[PDB]
């Protein structure tokens, strides 16, 4: 029970997948590289499975300085804590990966990381990522017919909701521990998620149909609490960021290399029809105005213009 006051220090961390999903391995890649690299004692205690409950719990964790000191987050799972942080990679934002890495490669998102600080208390140590987030549905939604009152979840934060809303579906914001009931209920039609996360929790066994929008590729902050961050040694503090850095670069290459295969994984399994969505880049012109909306109220109007 007796650890080292800011014998071991001991820091929790938390993950909603097994050991399988490229978030558990970035966290465990965290683990062994705070090993490497500190002269000194730290235990890492990594939670999985969900076991300590989903994103939406953790951030409120961390604001609050216990339960858990570590784990990964959503930019639009953080939206009430930090409201600038989920345009970081809000819909649409992205052209590709090559944008995507362009972003991630330099300080162009240091604002933010600022205002998560600064508003939540929540310290960025690294970026893992690279997934694509396609539309995940019981039934076939290929066209902009089929998409207009499509009843669909989102996460929580405003910008997710309003850029669906603008392609004319009904967005939800649903937990994501409630998703698969709802869709086997029939309460929704459907959500959006990358590859490793459907594979993972086997979504495709309630939403079989995946539909090729490809509108978010998503950036995963590792995150660790403000108040444990800033409590540990200065030395452990600079092994901290370095390891986070490190360690998000492994993940995202992970993640990013495996997308794809992944989603040829479960065509070939029979777990998964892929369709392309018709006249899909229309959805760039009808977007457009809800995300210039949404930086001009957060005061981030230039901030978005160098990332486009
Ligand atoms: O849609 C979600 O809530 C989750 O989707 C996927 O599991 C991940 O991108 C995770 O970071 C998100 O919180």
């Known amino acids: 029970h007796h650890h080292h006051h800011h014998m071991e220090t001991v820091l929790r ?57 570590y784990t990964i987050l959503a930019p639009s799972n953080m939206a009430k804590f930090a409201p600038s942080i989920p345009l970081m990679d809000m819909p649409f934002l992205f052209r590709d990966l090559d944008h995507w890495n362009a972003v991630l490669s330099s300080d162009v998102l240091a604002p933010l990381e600022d205002e998560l600080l600064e508003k939540a208390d929540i310290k960025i140590v690294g970026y893992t990522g690279g997934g694509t987030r396609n539309l995940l549905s019981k039934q076939p939604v290929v066209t902009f017919d089929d998409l207009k009152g499509h009843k669909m979840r989102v996460m929580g934060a405003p910008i997710q909701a309003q850029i669906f809303q603008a392609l004319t579906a009904a967005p939800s914001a649903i937990a994501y521990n409630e998703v698969y009931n709802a869709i086997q209920t ?10 490793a996360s459907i594979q993972n929790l086997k979504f495709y066994e309630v939403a079989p149909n995946l539909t090729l929008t490809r509108h978010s590729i998503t ?28 360690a998000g670069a492994y993940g995202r290459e992970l993640e990013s290399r495996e997308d794809g295969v992944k989603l040829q994984e479960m065509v070939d399994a029979g777990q998964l029809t892929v369709s392309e969505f018709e006249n899909r880049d229309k959805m760039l012109e009808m977007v457009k105005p809800v995300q210039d909306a949404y930086a001009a109220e957060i005061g981030a109007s230039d901030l978005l213009e160098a990332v486009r």
Not at 40 to 49: Q, Y
């Open 13 to 69: 961390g938390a993950s909603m997948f097994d050991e399988e999903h490229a978030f558990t391995k970035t966290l465990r890649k965290f683990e062994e590289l705070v090993d490497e690299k500190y002269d000194g004692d730290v235990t890492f205690d990594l939670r999985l499975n969900g076991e300590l409950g989903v994103e939406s719990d953790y951030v409120t964790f961390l604001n609050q300085g216990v339960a858990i000191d």
């Open 186 to 195: 029939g309460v929704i039609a459907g959500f959006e998620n990358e590859a």
């Open 219 to 246: 950036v995963r902050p590792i995150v660790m609490s403000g108040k444990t961050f800033n409590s540990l040694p200065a030395d452990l503090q600079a092994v901290v960021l370095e390891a986070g850095e490190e």
